[PDB]
């Protein structure tokens, strides 16, 4: 059958707000599993713009493209701990880099929703999609405690020390629900994957080393919740909260195992949704 092309089958949304979260760049001894290295990359505050395009070609089927992107460089933090001494549990080395920027971040999520239950107030379905999320940081300056506190001091202000990028991609499955009572509307979504593929890239500028890691078959959990009010029949003002957790996977390391790549993130935004027609 020929999909619905009526203007009212089409809805667009945009919101703005903030993204925050934390990533981990991990290294383990591939024999004992002993954690030898851990860099924690913080996303403290990044302004984002979030977009959504949704089309209902059929009553039971919605096609959706959504994502968000950083509006400018944001603030972050990085800490780098290393366990060089196999005998000792405490770390031998630590550097701290408060002057770490989140250069950019984004996410894209292309999905379908198959609506299986519906009445006047409630629509519920199964969703499946493809999603990718990327973050980029640059750590500059900072301080260090090396070789069990034998060497301590600071790195030169503004000098870039480590550059780091992560990306996670996956197909996911989920449950989506939509409640509408008069002018109030609530949407809730729960997403999951058991097959995340992750990559990262690390430029150690003071060692002229580039590291690359990749893992596959790791888990993801995500939620989306939004609530809003229709101020016209076609226009809804709303707020939205999202949470995503990319569990650590186990994979290989490259220098130009065993590596772990992980992330959690949150967004809080507010905006407007508009249905045509």
């Amino acid at each position: 059958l020929i999909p619905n092309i009526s203007p009212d089958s089409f809805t667009v949304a945009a919101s703005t707000g903030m993204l925050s979260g934390k990533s981990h760049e991990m290294l383990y001894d591939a024999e004992t599993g002993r954690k030898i290295s851990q860099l924690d990359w913080k996303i403290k505050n990044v302004a984002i713009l979030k977009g959504d395009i949704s089309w209902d070609p059929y009553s039971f089927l919605t096609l959706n493209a959504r994502g968000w992107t950083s509006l400018a460089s944001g603030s972050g933090n990085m800490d780098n701990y290393d366990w060089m001494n196999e005998n000792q549990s405490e770390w031998t080395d630590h550097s701290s880099h408060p002057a770490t920027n989140v250069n950019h971040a984004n996410e894209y999520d292309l999905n379908v929703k198959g609506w299986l239950l519906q009445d006047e107030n409630y629509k519920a379905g199964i969703t499946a999609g493809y999603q990718e999320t990327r973050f980029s940081w640059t750590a500059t300056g900072g301080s260090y405690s090396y070789n069990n506190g034998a060497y301590t001091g600071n790195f030169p202000k503004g000098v870039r020390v480590i550059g780091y990028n992560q990306r996670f991609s996956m197909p996911y499955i989920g449950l989506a629900g939509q409640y509408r009572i008069n002018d109030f509307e609530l949407n809730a979504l729960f997403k999951f994957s058991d097959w995340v593929r992750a990559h990262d890239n690390d430029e150690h500028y003071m060692r002229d080393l580039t590291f690359r890691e990749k893992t596959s078959g790791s888990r993801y959990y995500g939620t989306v919740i939004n609530a809003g009010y229709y101020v016209t029949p076609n226009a809804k003002v709303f707020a939205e909260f999202t949470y995503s957790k990319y569990d650590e996977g186990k994979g290989g390391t490259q220098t130009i195992d065993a590596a772990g790549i992980s992330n959690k993130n949150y967004t809080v935004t507010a905006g407007l949704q508009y249905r045509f027609g």
Partner: peptide, 11 residues
């Protein structure tokens, strides 16, 4: 060898 650390020279 120095894993992770900002500077190498682990000898």
């Amino acid at each position: 060898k120095c894993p992770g650390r900002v500077v190498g020279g682990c000898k």
